[PDB]
Amino acid sequence: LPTPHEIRNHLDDYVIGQEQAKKVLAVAVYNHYKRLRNGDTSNGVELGKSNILLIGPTGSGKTLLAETLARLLDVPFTMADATTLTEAGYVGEDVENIIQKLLQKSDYDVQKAQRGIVYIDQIDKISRKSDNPSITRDVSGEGVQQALLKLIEGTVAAVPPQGGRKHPQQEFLQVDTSKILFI
Amino acid sequence: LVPMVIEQTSRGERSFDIYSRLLKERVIFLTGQVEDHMANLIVAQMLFLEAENPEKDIYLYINSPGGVITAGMSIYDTMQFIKPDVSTICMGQAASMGAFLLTAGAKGKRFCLPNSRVMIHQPLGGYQGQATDIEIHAREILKVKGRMNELMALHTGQSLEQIERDTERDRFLSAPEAVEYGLVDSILTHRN
Ligand SMILES: Nc1ncnc2c1ncn2[C@@H]1O[C@H](COP(=O)(O)OP(=O)(O)OP(O)(O)=S)[C@@H](O)[C@H]1O
């Protein structure tokens, strides 16, 4: 039964001068645990999920907050990066890579992974270069954002568990994302 | 000096000069005396617009004290040859040749500002040499005077006899009188 004051006291030990940032995480963490705790068989149906966008100067401690949180957090946590992501199934990487990385921390537990938290770094790397809609395909940039839209709202993505043992299985495990939080 | 403006397009922002921006909208400026260089430049602009769009109206603003006849007659044939309707507007003044290009515009699309002024006279020339050579240049310039009156009557609708008497000497015509004379169609007082 964690509380914003208790969780903030723990985070305050590792971070200083980020009072505004800490409050946002405490509420989401407290609400997220509260949301999942609820059976959902009540008047409130399809409770909303508040995402988080951490913008700050260089070296201000953004990446550190996500790292310290996982130590105190019980539910699984994963820290990916949007540098390697490529849209349209290119050679670089796909967006599903984020989900399989979560299971590595969760030991391939679907019921326990949907309640996990996700973090992404260097999100500005995919912003358009202060231009109007492009005249060609931007694999890294405007294209990547289009793919993440449905993932943040909630959907099921194919993910080979453990990468797949051999040709025998040739299946993918559906992983809901409506409850997953994104930072 | 010429100021630069920015035209916003879907691809991006583009820097254009004030004269080139209006050229994109089928608008040409005729300023100063009509000479071989200024005339040959307008012809290329008219031809360029013909290929881009032959069905859109062209607007030609004229503010000039006139000039060489041969340079101006090349433009007159161009306006009549091409399919688009060349709308003409008189700003400030329109001399002998400037008036000829004004009336040569498309019927019903000729305008003159309320305070504009038109002036028309006969061709000017001269020669120095033997009497045999003077007679040749005199016969040639006389044909031009006759030819310029025939075309002036065609667009203005007046009779050749009337144009001959009014063009013997300088004749200034205000903007309202130009409408009554058939040279133009209306006046663009205000925007509607
Ligand atoms: N408030 C802080 N208290 C203590 N150490 C801090 C603090 N802020 C930053 N640091 C140090 O900065 C290191 C990296 O912090 P980051 O979270 O990476 O900062 P950053 O602005 O996120 O840099 P990016 O995200 O990679 S551009 C941490 O491992 C700490 O050693």
Domains of chain A: 1-183 (3.40.50.300)
B165 to chain A, any CB pair closer than 8 A? The answer is: no
Helix axes A4-14, A19-37, angle to 10 degrees: 140
In the annotation, is B17 catalytic?
no
Pairing of strands B171-174, B117-120: antiparallel
Q: Which atom of ligand 1 is nearest to the CA of A65?
A: 17
Cα A41 to the center of its chain, rounded Å: 26
Residue nearest to atom 9 of ligand 1 (CA): A61
CA distance B21 to B15: 9
Which tokens is A164 given?
A: 């797949």
Ligand 1 center to residue A131 CA distance, Å? 31
Minimal Cα–Cα distance from A130 to chain B, Å?
Answer: 11
In the annotation, is B137 catalytic?
no
Determination method here?
Answer: cryo-EM
Cα A60 to the center of its chain, rounded Å: 21
A:B CB pairs within 8 Å: 6
B8 to chain A, any CB pair closer than 8 A? The answer is: no
Q: Residue B158: which of B120, B124, B188 has the closest Cα?
A: B120
Are B185 and B178 in contact, with CB atoms under 8 Å apart?
no
Burial code (b: 16+ CB inside 10 Å, e: under 16) for A28-49 equals bbbbbbebeeeeeeeeeeeeeb
Print the SS3 string covering chain B. CCCEEEEECCCCEEEEEHHHHHHHCCEEEEECCCCHHHHHHHHHHHHHHHHHCCCCCEEEEEEECCCCHHHHHHHHHHHHHCCCCEEEEEEEEECHHHHHHHHCCCCCCEEECCCCEEEECCCCCCCCCCHHHHHHHHHHHHHHHHHHHHHHHHHHCCCHHHHHHHCCCCEEEEHHHHHHCCCCCECCCCCC
Minimal Cα–Cα distance from B50 to chain A, Å?
Answer: 29
Pairing of strands A117-121, A181-182: parallel
Are B90 and B98 in contact, with CB atoms under 8 Å apart?
yes
Domains of chain B: 1-191 (3.90.226.10)
Dihedral sign computed on CA atoms, order A138, A144, A145, A149: positive
Which tokens is B99 given?
A: 């008036």
Beta partners for residue A18, in sequence order: none
Pairing of strands B58-64, B117-120: unpaired
A1 to chain B, any CB pair closer than 8 A? The answer is: no
Dihedral sign computed on CA atoms, order A73, A78, A81, A86: negative
Q: How many CB atoms lie within 10 A of CB B79?
A: 20
Are A121 and A63 in contact, with CB atoms under 8 Å apart?
yes
Are B136 and B143 in contact, with CB atoms under 8 Å apart?
no
One-letter identity of residue A106: S
